[PDB]
Amino acid sequence: DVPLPAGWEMAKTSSGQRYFLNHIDQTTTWQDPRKA
């Protein structure tokens, strides 16, 4: 289950946007946690 971080939300926008929320910090992430 680690390949998909647990405090991270999968905001999959059909427009072609994959942004990840850290629902712990309320951090707006445009970088894939495995890409960084």
Binding site: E9, A11, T13, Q17, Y19, L21, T28, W30
Partner: peptide, 9 residues
């Protein structure tokens, strides 16, 4: 469980 919004609009 609240959907936010895309960080840039």
């Amino acid at each position: 469980s609240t959907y936010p919004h895309s960080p840039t609009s």
